[PDB]
């Protein structure tokens, strides 16, 4: 139709269709879950392999010693945004000699990604981000969207089939805050597993875990460092 090609065209219903299509771009990606306790923020990303002979695509990126992200949607847009966030964190450490507070970084992201939603010939970023951070206010989980809106969350899941993960997180959100690190990671892993097909199970090949905490700088566990977190997982309840 005539209203669904340009990001500068309002539809007669008060919507912008290009922004919703970028939202669909985020929904096409593989699932990822983020949750926080009193002291830790955990991202667990289900990685997807294009072929049987390919490595699983990286989903968790370093931003700074206290901030990491997991991505859904267009990977190159995610790399653009990650470079921007890294530059902001380095600017903060250069000027103020302090780590940039997470919510200020998320505000900068929202400001940067709102601009192309109003200018002709631009497009929205087609990437959704889960941002795990730790600062003076404790742990933080943030969700950023192609619409440039962002949410402070107790827990969140984005990507394909993320509604099941969101239901599980709804169920155990009351438990999350008093969990220790291993229990929190296991909650995230169960939520991520709820988005899997029946045949597929969580393995050290398709699971990536990012953790940040009070005394713990942001760390990524990919293949063999994931096994201690996978050990002890009960079989899928079905």
């Amino acid at each position: 139709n005539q209203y669904d090609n340009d990001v500068t065209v309002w539809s007669p219903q008060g919507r912008i269709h290009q922004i919703e299509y970028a939202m669909e771009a985020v929904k096409q990606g593989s699932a990822t879950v983020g949750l926080k306790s009193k002291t830790h923020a955990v991202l667990v990303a289900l990685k997807r392999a294009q072929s049987e002979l390919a490595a699983h695509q990286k989903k968790i990126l370093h931003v700074d010693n206290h901030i990491g992200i997991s991505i859904a949607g267009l990977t190159a847009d995610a790399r653009l945004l990650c470079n921007f966030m890294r530059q902001e964190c380095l600017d903060s450490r250069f000027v103020f000699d302090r780590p940039l507070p997470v919510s200020r970084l998320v505000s900068l992201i929202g400001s940067k990604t709102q601009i192309p939603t109003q200018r002709y010939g631009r497009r929205p970023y087609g990437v959704g981000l889960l941002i795990a951070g730790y600062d003076d206010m404790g742990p933080h989980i943030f969700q950023t969207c192609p619409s440039a809106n962002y949410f402070d969350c107790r827990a969140m899941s984005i990507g394909a089939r993320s509604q099941s993960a969101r239901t599980y997180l709804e169920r155990h959100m009351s438990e999350f805050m008093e969990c220790n690190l291993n229990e929190l990671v296991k909650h995230g892993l169960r939520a991520l597993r709820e988005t899997l097909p029946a045949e597929q199970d969580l393995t050290t090949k398709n699971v990536s875990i990012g953790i940040v905490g009070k005394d713990l700088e942001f760390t990524i566990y990919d293949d063999d460092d994931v096994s201690p977190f996978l050990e002890g997982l009960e079989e899928r309840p079905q």
């Binding site: 669904d4 090609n5 340009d6 269709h17 290009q18 299509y21 970028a22 939202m23 669909e24 771009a25 985020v26 929904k27 096409q28 294009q50 072929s51 049987e52 002979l53 390919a54 490595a55 695509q57 949607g73 267009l74 990977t75 190159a76 847009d77 790399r79 653009l80 200018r119 002709y120 010939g121 631009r122 497009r123 929205p124 087609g126």
Partner: protein, 236 residues
């Protein structure tokens, strides 16, 4: 018809139309195969010569990015020229600044950062007007050993044990999946690459129809001469 939408319009399914069309353009390219073993990476491309009067040596579908990194391309080669030039410049820049060889992954990342830098508005004059119509296989040897990376016009790059790009990449990929095991040797990798290329090539496979190159730990990028090509092909 083609100017109704801008180059940066999302489809209702969340895909950029132009990126999808470039992906479709790559299916018209000649087939390239990369195999990563523990002893090195092998790359093999069908030259796809159209006329007897054309000189096959003037087709360069495998190029040296650096002494330790080579690149096979599929799709629109003229588009791949600028990406390859950028890769060479980035490797030399990294050597100039840090006095060391760039890893294969960081070179692939640098090249992939260019894939979506196209647009009509909010651009400098002469900036890219469309995505590149190429798929690249980077094969190199760095401190992490031998590595093979696939890059596509969407800007996604992935590590691969073995991969086929081009026109027959589906059947060739299925053949790669049965043939490839982790402890494969480089000689077996080269032989299996040539077998699959012979299976999928429309023409008969001789020492002039194909390019084959290897990167190994301790040996630079090496493009197989036609005598070596005939040595390998003699028993297929």
């Amino acid at each position: 018809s083609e100017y109704d939408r801008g180059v940066n319009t999302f489809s209702p399914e969340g895909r950029l139309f132009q990126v999808e069309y470039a992906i479709e353009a790559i299916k018209l390219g000649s087939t390239a195969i990369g195999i990563q073993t523990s002893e090195g990476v092998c790359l093999a491309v069908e030259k796809r010569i159209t006329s007897p009067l054309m000189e096959p040596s003037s087709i360069e579908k495998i190029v040296e990015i650096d002494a330790h990194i080579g690149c096979a391309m599929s799709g629109l080669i003229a588009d791949a020229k600028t990406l390859i030039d950028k890769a060479r410049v980035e490797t030399q820049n990294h050597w100039f600044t840090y006095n060391e060889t760039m890893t294969v992954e960081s070179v692939t990342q640098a090249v992939s950062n260019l894939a979506l830098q196209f647009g009509e508005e909010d651009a400098d004059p002469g900036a890219m007007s469309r995505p590149f119509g190429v798929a690249l296989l980077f094969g190199g040897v760095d401190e992490k050993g031998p590595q093979l990376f696939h890059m596509d016009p969407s800007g996604t790059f992935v590590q691969c044990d073995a991969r086929a790009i081009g026109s027959a990449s589906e059947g060739a990929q299925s053949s790669l999946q049965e043939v490839y095991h982790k402890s494969m040797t480089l000689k077996e990798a080269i032989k299996s690459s040539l077998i699959i290329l012979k299976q999928v090539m429309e023409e008969k496979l001789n020492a002039t129809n194909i390019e084959l190159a290897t990167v190994q730990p301790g040996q630079n990028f090496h493009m197989f001469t036609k005598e070596e090509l005939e040595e390998v092909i003699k028993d297929i």
